[PDB]
Design a binder for this molecule. Sequence first.
Ligand SMILES: *[C@@H]1O[C@H](CO)[C@@H](O[C@@H]2O[C@H](CO)[C@@H](O[C@@H]3O[C@H](CO[C@H]4O[C@H](CO)[C@@H](O)[C@H](O[C@H]5O[C@H](CO)[C@@H](O)[C@H](O)[C@@H]5O)[C@@H]4O)[C@@H](O)[C@H](O[C@H]4O[C@H](CO)[C@@H](O)[C@H](O)[C@@H]4O[C@H]4O[C@H](CO)[C@@H](O)[C@H](O)[C@@H]4O)[C@@H]3O)[C@H](O)[C@H]2NC(C)=O)[C@H](O)[C@H]1NC(C)=O
Ligand SMILES: *[C@@H]1O[C@H](CO)[C@@H](O[C@@H]2O[C@H](CO)[C@@H](O[C@H]3O[C@H](CO)[C@@H](O)[C@H](O[C@H]4O[C@H](CO)[C@@H](O)[C@H](O)[C@@H]4O[C@H]4O[C@H](CO)[C@@H](O)[C@H](O)[C@@H]4O[C@H]4O[C@H](CO)[C@@H](O)[C@H](O)[C@@H]4O)[C@@H]3O)[C@H](O)[C@H]2NC(C)=O)[C@H](O)[C@H]1NC(C)=O
Ligand SMILES: *[C@@H]1O[C@H](CO)[C@@H](O[C@@H]2O[C@H](CO)[C@@H](O[C@H]3O[C@H](CO)[C@@H](O)[C@H](O)[C@@H]3O)[C@H](O)[C@H]2NC(C)=O)[C@H](O)[C@H]1NC(C)=O
Ligand SMILES: *[C@@H]1O[C@H](CO)[C@@H](O[C@@H]2O[C@H](CO)[C@@H](O)[C@H](O)[C@H]2NC(C)=O)[C@H](O)[C@H]1NC(C)=O
Ligand SMILES: *[C@@H]1O[C@H](CO)[C@@H](O)[C@H](O)[C@H]1NC(C)=O
Ligand SMILES: *[C@@H]1O[C@H](CO)[C@@H](O)[C@H](O)[C@H]1NC(C)=O
Ligand SMILES: *[C@@H]1O[C@H](CO)[C@@H](O)[C@H](O)[C@H]1NC(C)=O
Ligand SMILES: *[C@@H]1O[C@H](CO)[C@@H](O)[C@H](O)[C@H]1NC(C)=O
Lengths: 202, 761
Amino acid sequence: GSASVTLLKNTGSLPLKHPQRIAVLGNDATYNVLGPNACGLANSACDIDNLNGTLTTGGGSGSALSPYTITPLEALQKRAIEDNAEIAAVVANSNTTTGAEDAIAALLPDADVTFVFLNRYSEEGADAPDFSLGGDGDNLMDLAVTYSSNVVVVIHTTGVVDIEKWADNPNVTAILVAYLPGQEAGNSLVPVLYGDVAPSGK
Amino acid sequence: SNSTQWPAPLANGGKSWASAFKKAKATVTEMTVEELANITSGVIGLCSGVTGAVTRLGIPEFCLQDGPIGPRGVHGSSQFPAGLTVAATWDRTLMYARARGMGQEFHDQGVHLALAPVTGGPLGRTPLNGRGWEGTFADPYACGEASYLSVKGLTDAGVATVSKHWIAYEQETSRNLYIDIDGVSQADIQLPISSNVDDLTMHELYMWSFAEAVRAGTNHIMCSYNRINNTHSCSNAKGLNQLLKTELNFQGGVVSDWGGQWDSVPAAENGLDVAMPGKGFLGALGDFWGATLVELINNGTVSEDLVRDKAVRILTGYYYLGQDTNPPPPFVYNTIGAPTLNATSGYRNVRKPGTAELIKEIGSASVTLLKNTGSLPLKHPQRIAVLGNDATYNVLGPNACGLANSACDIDNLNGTLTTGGGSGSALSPYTITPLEALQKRAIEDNAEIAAVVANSNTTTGAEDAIAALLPDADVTFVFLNRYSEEGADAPDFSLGGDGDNLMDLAVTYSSNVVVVIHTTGVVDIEKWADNPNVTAILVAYLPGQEAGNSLVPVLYGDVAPSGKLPWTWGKSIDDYVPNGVVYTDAYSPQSNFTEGVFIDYRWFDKMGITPRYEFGFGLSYTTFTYSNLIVDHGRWAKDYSSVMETAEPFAEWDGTNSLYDVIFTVFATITNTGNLTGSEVAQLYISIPGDNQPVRQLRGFDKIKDLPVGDSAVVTFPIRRKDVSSWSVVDQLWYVPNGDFLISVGGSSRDLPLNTTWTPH
Ligand SMILES: *[C@@H]1O[C@H](CO)[C@@H](O[C@@H]2O[C@H](CO)[C@@H](O[C@@H]3O[C@H](CO[C@H]4O[C@H](CO)[C@@H](O)[C@H](O[C@H]5O[C@H](CO)[C@@H](O)[C@H](O)[C@@H]5O)[C@@H]4O)[C@@H](O)[C@H](O[C@H]4O[C@H](CO)[C@@H](O)[C@H](O)[C@@H]4O[C@H]4O[C@H](CO)[C@@H](O)[C@H](O)[C@@H]4O)[C@@H]3O)[C@H](O)[C@H]2NC(C)=O)[C@H](O)[C@H]1NC(C)=O
Ligand SMILES: *[C@@H]1O[C@H](CO)[C@@H](O[C@@H]2O[C@H](CO)[C@@H](O[C@H]3O[C@H](CO)[C@@H](O)[C@H](O[C@H]4O[C@H](CO)[C@@H](O)[C@H](O)[C@@H]4O[C@H]4O[C@H](CO)[C@@H](O)[C@H](O)[C@@H]4O[C@H]4O[C@H](CO)[C@@H](O)[C@H](O)[C@@H]4O)[C@@H]3O)[C@H](O)[C@H]2NC(C)=O)[C@H](O)[C@H]1NC(C)=O
Ligand SMILES: *[C@@H]1O[C@H](CO)[C@@H](O[C@@H]2O[C@H](CO)[C@@H](O[C@H]3O[C@H](CO)[C@@H](O)[C@H](O)[C@@H]3O)[C@H](O)[C@H]2NC(C)=O)[C@H](O)[C@H]1NC(C)=O
Ligand SMILES: *[C@@H]1O[C@H](CO)[C@@H](O[C@@H]2O[C@H](CO)[C@@H](O)[C@H](O)[C@H]2NC(C)=O)[C@H](O)[C@H]1NC(C)=O
Ligand SMILES: *[C@@H]1O[C@H](CO)[C@@H](O)[C@H](O)[C@H]1NC(C)=O
Ligand SMILES: *[C@@H]1O[C@H](CO)[C@@H](O)[C@H](O)[C@H]1NC(C)=O
Ligand SMILES: *[C@@H]1O[C@H](CO)[C@@H](O)[C@H](O)[C@H]1NC(C)=O
Ligand SMILES: *[C@@H]1O[C@H](CO)[C@@H](O)[C@H](O)[C@H]1NC(C)=O
């Protein structure tokens, strides 16, 4: 994970120093709400709108079960606590959950950094129709750039996605792609974000 | 109502605030009328309330800030466990340290007056009370002890306390704070519930805790929203002028609850000293003093001296705590909220090293084991299932529900209930979720762990995920909660969100279900409490920010559970004091406290009703055997320790003595007779003789720490003169009655292996 996470954009926001107020966005930052193995033997049987959490692997016969997932939020919070900082995550569906937009609007302005975790599930037996982000990713980004000027994007994905609407936004200070990191998702990522190891994936 | 019958005595400064009073006189003596009205009424500011400055005389604005778990609406602080949770520790060291820590965060955030603690209002009379959780024990003695130490902690940090809510504030329904915006006035719709309380009940039940608060040196007291005998508490002359200011000899200021003042002139005469919020909250909650009191004084209705005594009471605390020569810093957060106040916020980090660890410790000292068939402590389980949104975060963030933890949608998944709703809440820098802490330990054991943390009823596939996960799990944890808030009482004991459904599913698919309850009060677990698939039940109350990491070490047996219930857990709401909350549309709603002193376990004991889990009940991973009860009448001692003195009359007074002298001490021995190290909260109950008297009253507790297997420890209970007395209605004084006092000692209110009789004069 640490050797592969790929830094695509950085205007000087990374590595992080010791930020004191940290905002997180996206269900990808936390657990599948039905459990890491809820989608079944092929990681492909959860409902179309289910919040699957961190995309640690793809769908179909080349997936596998997981004894746990070390979520980005957990790993970010651990480091926040070491710096005596505050951290808060909006991890619901930003379109369909009552109060989610307002919660994001109220959270992001005072944060020193805001992390948006995006994903794009794909699977055996079908091709992706386009490069569009999975779930509410488009809307998370739209909201993130509206309410914050230090947005750091992390993408867990099976392939290339469409970030054309935001990659040249002056409020997106950094972008990374972490691909499909397996069970150690958060703890492989956070040391790169905080500069313990320089990213080296390409 | 009658302030000729019940006149207002003048502040003199009492025992510890003599130099402070002297300074207060001097400064007040130089003030104009303009200036008396400025400090005696609230003004617009960033704090919950702000007094007007006396800026000619160098006297700044006092920040009055919520609440009883620490400064509310503030970033850069810690979320402490609620009062209910420290109560469950039965640990005086933790009660003090908790408040001392809140205290430093209050002072360092720039707060002069903390709107805290809750010191016996509500106490309380109903287990449905929305904000009962803000208090501590449902018992006058134990509430009294924790009240003393809470005020002491806050004052020792340099923050003045406003102990609340005086008095008989025992329901949120129809509390009816005064509002008067455009047309709609609360005066036109419904008066506040009237608590109608006899003289004995008021003395032996509700005043007890406030008497301890006064003795610890509360600088101020908040008068409550309810009426008493159909007169508002904030303008009750019997209440404020006589009972508090004469009999309790209270030398500090009475601060109105926000909308607790309804009159101008009765309030001024009958004991109120500060009008809040004043110009705050758009003047909407009444603005009955300010320029109106300026007019009332120099047209002859309200005495000038009377209003000078009010400002003296306010300023005493200022000088006593050294706020003149060691001022607190600027308060930098907008805690009111737009659109009511449009103002920006700065930032200040106030979290000290040690605070996080203390909060953790309070959680581990309070979590209360109610059922154990032998599944706990855990060994090294390899497949772990977790049920409940309470096991993880609020899906919108820890603070999503706003400045009072109460603005989230009715169906929002709020995560771990680490605190309650309302002005007693506080923001959180993070939450250490139960799931996070359980997973950390599972990973140490090379185990696997999966949580279903969605709403189990409304989320597609949630029920099927649960059914597929549970059968193969070695242990299944179910996390449940029940949010309640200020401004409404719970309708019943039912669990919040999907709690009932989670339990039905859990017992269907697993025969090793461990239940953990985060709650503001008693909940209904009757469907599942006797199901043998439920191998253990624990109540964790409201643990604050360190929820998960306080809990898991108990579950895994690094520390034995040690907390005990601070109220009674009855099988049904119908088993409690009747008319616990009165719902009516009648203009003048009435609550008659016809039960008298018999609330919580006193009611249960008198009516012969067995609770599921009694007052003072909690299991350990070991057992304690009691022996060798000793009453040492030679072990007496004069009351020197208190910060302030009351003037409570009593029969045995001779010039020398006090109602709070310790007149004997009782001792007992506990031996750890199980197979693991454990702490034990020993308890002492006394049956005071008399007519219509409680079967048992708590008069002592002592927590022995980490007693090894086979070892013994001596447990110690000082008994004050007041602890053995009754209030005489005829003679209007306390007295030690004649007859037989049974002194009972053991591990709970219904497990008392040791007893002896004491017969006085
Ligand atoms: C809300 O409402 C309630 C109900 O109205 C108020 O409760 C009342 O409170 C007052 C105190 O302000 C009590 O007054 C005292 O009453 C004494 C006599 O009591 C008997 O009176 C009637 C008989 O019809 C009954 O109400 C009482 O019955 C109740 O109590 C008994 C005993 O426990 C129970 O068994 C019953 O079931 C009832 O619950 C009594 O039978 C009276 O002696 C006393 O007078 C002394 O004190 C006053 C004030 O200091 C002096 O002015 C006066 O001169 C007397 O003092 C002299 O004598 C003594 C020695 O005897 C000396 O020590 C003194 O130096 C002095 O020389 C007083 O009038 C009233 O009884 C009580 N009622 C109830 C039902 O509780 C609440 O206060 C009120 N609360 C608020 C906040 O407003
Ligand atoms: C959490 O995780 C969940 C899983 O655990 C995620 O849910 C899954 O999400 C995926 C997409 O993200 C979803 O995919 C399928 O949805 C339906 C299901 O029935 C299908 O229609 C889709 O397949 C079609 O579309 C693809 C792109 O357009 C295409 O590559 C694919 O081959 C297929 O198209 C054929 O079918 C159409 C006929 O209706 C034709 O119009 C089309 O041209 C293609 O025709 C070919 O095949 C036909 C046979 O049917 C044949 O008639 C024709 O001749 C020709 O050969 C799509 O794969 C999963 O269903 C969904 N799983 C569940 C259980 O709902 C979830 O999204 C994730 N959450 C988040 C937030 O990301
Ligand atoms: C009656 O109460 C009023 C509100 O408390 C008070 O007005 C306030 O006076 C204080 C001075 O104590 C001012 O505070 C600040 O003033 C400047 C602002 O740049 C600072 O340099 C100072 O350090 C100080 O912090 C408030 O600005 C002022 N508030 C308002 C709304 O005017 C009255 O003066 C009081 N009146 C009397 C007669 O005592
Ligand atoms: C999560 O918290 C919210 C408040 O932040 C709860 O919503 C309130 O619930 C009470 C009943 O206890 C209602 O009378 C209020 O009107 C609700 N408030 C709002 C603004 O809707 C909510 O019930 C909690 N969620 C769960 C699952 O218990
Ligand atoms: C960048 O963020 C600020 C608020 O931080 C917002 O006002 C501005 O419109 C944003 N700009 C873009 C291009 O998203
Ligand atoms: C005194 O001033 C008050 C407040 O303005 C006013 O209501 C009252 O009528 C005045 N005169 C009296 C009571 O004689
Ligand atoms: C207890 O759990 C088992 C499955 O492990 C189930 O068959 C049984 O019906 C349950 N019993 C009760 C009384 O809930
Ligand atoms: C409350 O008190 C009096 C008895 O003194 C009684 O007349 C009144 O009706 C009572 N109210 C209710 C609702 O029972």
